[PDB]
Amino acid sequence: AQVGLIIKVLGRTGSRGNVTQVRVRLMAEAGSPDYNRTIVRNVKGPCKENDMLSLMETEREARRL
Amino acid sequence: HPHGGGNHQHIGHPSTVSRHSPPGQKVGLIAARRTGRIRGGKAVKGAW
Amino acid sequence: ETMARKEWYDVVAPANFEKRQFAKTICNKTQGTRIAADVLRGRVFEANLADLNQSAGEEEAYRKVRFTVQEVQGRNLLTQFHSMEVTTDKMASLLRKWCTTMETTVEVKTADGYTMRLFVVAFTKPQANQQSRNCYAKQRLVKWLRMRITKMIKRRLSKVQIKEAVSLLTRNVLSDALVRRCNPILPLRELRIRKVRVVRTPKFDAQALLSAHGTIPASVEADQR
Amino acid sequence: AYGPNVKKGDLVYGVVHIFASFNDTFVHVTDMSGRETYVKVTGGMKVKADRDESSPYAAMMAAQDVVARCKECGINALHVKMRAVGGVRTKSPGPGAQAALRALARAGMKIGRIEDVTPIPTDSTRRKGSRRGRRL
Amino acid sequence: GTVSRPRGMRPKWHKKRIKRLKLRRRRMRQRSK
Amino acid sequence: TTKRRNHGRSKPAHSRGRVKPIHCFNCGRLTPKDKAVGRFVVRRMLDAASARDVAEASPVYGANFPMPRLYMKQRFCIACAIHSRTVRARPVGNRKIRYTKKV
RNA sequence: CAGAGGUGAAAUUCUUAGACCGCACCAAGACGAACUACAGCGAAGGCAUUCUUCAAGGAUACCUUCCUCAAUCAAGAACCAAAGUGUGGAGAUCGAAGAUGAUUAGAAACCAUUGUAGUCCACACUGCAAACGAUGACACCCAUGAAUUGGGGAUAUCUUUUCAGCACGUUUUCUGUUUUUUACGCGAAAGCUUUGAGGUUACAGUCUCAGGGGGGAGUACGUUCGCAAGAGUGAAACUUAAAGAAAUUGACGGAAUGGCACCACAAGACGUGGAGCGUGCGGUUUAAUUUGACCAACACGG
Ligand SMILES: [K+]
Ligand SMILES: [Mg+2]
Ligand SMILES: [Mg+2]
Ligand SMILES: [Mg+2]
Ligand SMILES: [Mg+2]
Ligand SMILES: [Mg+2]
Ligand SMILES: [Mg+2]
Ligand SMILES: [Mg+2]
Ligand SMILES: [Mg+2]
Ligand SMILES: [Mg+2]
Ligand SMILES: [Mg+2]
Ligand SMILES: [Mg+2]
Ligand SMILES: [Mg+2]
Ligand SMILES: [Mg+2]
Ligand SMILES: [Mg+2]
Ligand SMILES: [Mg+2]
Ligand SMILES: [Mg+2]
Ligand SMILES: [Mg+2]
Ligand SMILES: [Mg+2]
Ligand SMILES: [Mg+2]
Ligand SMILES: [Mg+2]
Ligand SMILES: [Mg+2]
Ligand SMILES: [Mg+2]
Ligand SMILES: [Mg+2]
Ligand SMILES: [Mg+2]
Ligand SMILES: [Mg+2]
Ligand SMILES: [Mg+2]
């Protein structure tokens, strides 16, 4: 369960606007292969900048749409 | 002739006959792979 | 397990390539009438020219060279030049709109035999002073350029052996000579040999093959692990 | 147990052919000649729905299976050759092309030359469909 | 809708109907002839 | 009621008689080459996020040697160009404006 | 080595018989990508690989020749996309008819897999296209700015060991071509504008074809041509007050763009719809069950 920090909110994606797209910086240890690695994710529920997520799979990256 | 006879002029049995039919019986379409109007590219006739 | 039957082999490029033992391949262990040596011959291996020539620059990273296995020496697959081709991305990126793409096809036979087809492509260029919307070329000049390219390739490539011809194509010597003698006919943005392919080959000579490979590097595939 | 007699850590190169259609994705690892194939895994071997055969996730799963088998075979580096269906049909690669290549890279496989090798006709036969095209 | 009113059925198919009708009258006269 | 002076194609009235048709990129509809909407596309083989990982794992590719890109000449029929938003309907006055370079 | 194909999703279909996939090969028939353009050629239809050929054709150049030989046309003749017809060939791809699987209330369609005739070539017919610039041919005047193709005049840049005293390119000019942007004038307007739809009630350069409200009807008959399909020619009876054309404002769109709303949705909460009962509406019944109202009627006419 990799923990990621939301550094910015890209926007409200989806037709209904319930899902939002954010840029997530992984909160890994220093020297780890995932140190300072940023990915784009789709988040369900109210999320704000500086929030933290529990990513089950870090390989997948959300579409920029 | 195998095709002779009848109160109408007809072959009463399929005219496509086996390759192994004895002489006298091997009349008609001999060991035919197909019949009809071919209907398309004409295959090269003869053996393979 | 399928890999149990497999034996490993080394593919060796001729001596005019800096890296000799490029690539590795597998083959079924000769399980009887199905001899590995009989089935290996004729296999074509494609490699990037940059990998074959380490000293080569940026331009050689966009050319692929194919080699045909002419003989199986132990675990070494001694090969002969088969074809050379420019990569898809580089060739597609060379095309520009407001100019004419001029293509030439030249078929020559070397001293050993080895008929090959050359497939030269050229593009017209706007002049530095030019401000016209297009730089299209008159068909008279295109025919002249095609004629001169054909003569030069036939003259130069028909007096040399197969190994020298491959060296000329690999080291851009023939291409540079073409572009230098063809610019006076027509301002060329770029003259490039798109694809070389051997279409006909003489009867198989091993002595000439051994002479073409020089000193053959050994392979340790059959050695004890 | 399987692999060439080479020093540990030296790169052994295969060729991965990534056929990314809009109906399926192929991850096919061969040697440099292309005659011998080490492992072929398709996107439809990882999903049960026909619509999910060409999904990026199916390509990712197929690539991971390829990486495991290539590890067993001794291959640790790969030249990639990606193609669309080509010919007279569409030249756009399928959804799983990027997914398969990224999954191979992330799974520890070394990546060599990348080339697009989709079939390009210099002049083609008639394309499927009428002169009115496919009407939807 | 690149065209204005046909005003009483598509004229192409009306011409086809007239053509079939002409052929029918032709065959009838041929029978009588 | 002529909508366009050029009738939606690049064929003046005394230049040619016929332009050989081409198949649409999407649907395959046969349309004259001059009339079809032609866009030259230079598409990256991988997106930026995935290209980073592949370039990381590639000795060949990196900050000095760029990765290959796809080059396609895409010609669309009018219906497929409109539906894919390559072109849109425009106000009558704005129909005249033209572009010569990819901006 | 276990699926592949195909699709909104599937299935008809192919697949341990090894399909799909991969490499190098073949065969055959088409086709000639990108370059490919408000570009070139051609009478029109049409015409894109290279090389070698055969007649041509135009433009330009000319202090060459000649001396009205011309323009346009009933009758008459030749060419003419695709489809179609005949006879041979070809048959890779695609594909009328047909079949099957889907989707549907039905679907003989659109979609999928196929599939015959056809598609391709030769010869001979056919001669009906939105064969369109919906704009007949020839000739004259005609404002402006960028261009573009071909040939010639005159005089900044690049290459310059042989189809080479070269080729391109700059500036200016010129004849001929396909055009574009923005002046009169014209037009019902859309629009056209040395490329006219201008130079027309201030109506006359020349020739020629066609039209005279809508249909019936490009039908009937006769007749010519055609193998046939049909083509050319072509009515009338009867019916009908409009049919049309271009613009304007609305309205509508299973067309785009930007916003907005819990009488919308999303995240949810309480419910209603199921039970009993109160009440209103309808129906039934009745002498009467008085009547209005059917999102914006129905605990509403307080
Ligand atoms: K009988
Ligand atoms: Mg008997
Ligand atoms: Mg009888
Ligand atoms: Mg009978
Ligand atoms: Mg030019
Ligand atoms: Mg499938
Ligand atoms: Mg549609
Ligand atoms: Mg409309
Ligand atoms: Mg309209
Ligand atoms: Mg009208
Ligand atoms: Mg012309
Ligand atoms: Mg035409
Ligand atoms: Mg257009
Ligand atoms: Mg097989
Ligand atoms: Mg070409
Ligand atoms: Mg035909
Ligand atoms: Mg025929
Ligand atoms: Mg016959
Ligand atoms: Mg088919
Ligand atoms: Mg007509
Ligand atoms: Mg007309
Ligand atoms: Mg010209
Ligand atoms: Mg003008
Ligand atoms: Mg008639
Ligand atoms: Mg709100
Ligand atoms: Mg309201
Ligand atoms: Mg109320």
Q: How far apart are CA E22 and CA E8, in angstroms?
A: 20
Which residues, in sequence order, are CB contacts of F59 under 8 Å at separation 6+?
D110, D112
3-state SS class at C152: helix
Q: How far apart are CA F41 and CA D76, in angstroms?
A: 34
Instruction: Write the DSSP assignment of D70-136 as a string of letters.
Output: HHHHT--EEEEEEE-S-TTS--SPPTHHHHHHHHHHHTT-EEEEEEE-----SS--PPSS-TT----
Classify each residue of D77-93 as buried b or exposed e, where b means 16 or more C-beta atoms within 10 Å of its C-beta. bbbbbbbbbbebbbbbb
What's the farthest any 2 CA atoms get from each other in chain D?
61
Classify each residue of D42-63 as buried b or exposed e, where b means 16 or more C-beta atoms within 10 Å of its C-beta. bbbebbeeeeebbbbbbbbbbb
Q: How far apart are CA A12 and CA C179, in angstroms?
A: 56
Q: How many CB atoms lie within 10 A of CB F64?
A: 6
CA distance D98 to chain A (A): 12
Q: Which residue is nearest to nucleotide G35 (CA to C1')?
A: C101
CB contact under 8 Å between D88 and F59, yes or no, is no
Distances (CA, A) of D90 to C114, D126, F33, F52: 38, 13, 18, 27
Domains with residue ranges and CATH for chain A: 1-65 (2.40.50.140)
Answer yes or no: are the C-beta atoms of C222 and C18 closer than 8 Å.
Answer: no
Q: Is residue D127 within 8 angstroms of chain A, CB to CB?
A: no
Q: How far is the CA of F93 from the C1' of G209 (A)?
A: 39
CB contact under 8 Å between D57 and A60, yes or no, is yes
Which residues, in sequence order, are CB contacts of D96 under 8 Å at separation 6+?
D18, D20, D25, D43, D54, D55, D56, D58, D59, D60, D62
Torsion angle, alpha carbons of C93, C98, C102, C103, to 10: 40
- Which sign does the torsion angle of CA C172, C174, C178, C181 carry? positive
**Strands of the sheet with C188-193, listed across from one edge:** C101-104, C120-124, C188-193
Answer yes or no: are the C-beta atoms of D25 and D17 closer than 8 Å.
Answer: no
Distances (CA, A) of C213 to C12, C14, C47, C65, C147: 8, 5, 17, 16, 35
F89 DSSP assignment: -
Strand G contact with E15 (CB < 7 A): yes
Residue D136 among known ligand-binding residues: yes
In the structure, do chain B and chain E come into contact, i.e. share 3 or more CB pairs under 8 Å?
no
Q: Which element (helix H / strand E) includes D14? A: strand D13-20
CB contact under 8 Å between D133 and F30, yes or no, is yes
- Report, in ranges, which bases of strand G sit under 7 Å from a protein C-beta: 1-11, 20-25, 29-42, 44-52, 90-96, 110-113, 115-117, 130, 132-135, 147-151, 156-164, 166-171, 177-182, 190-192, 195, 197, 215-221, 229-230, 243-247, 255-257, 265-267
Chain F, 37-76: which CBs lie within 7 Å of strand G? 38, 40, 71, 73, 75
Method: cryo-EM
CB contact under 8 Å between D4 and C43, yes or no, is no
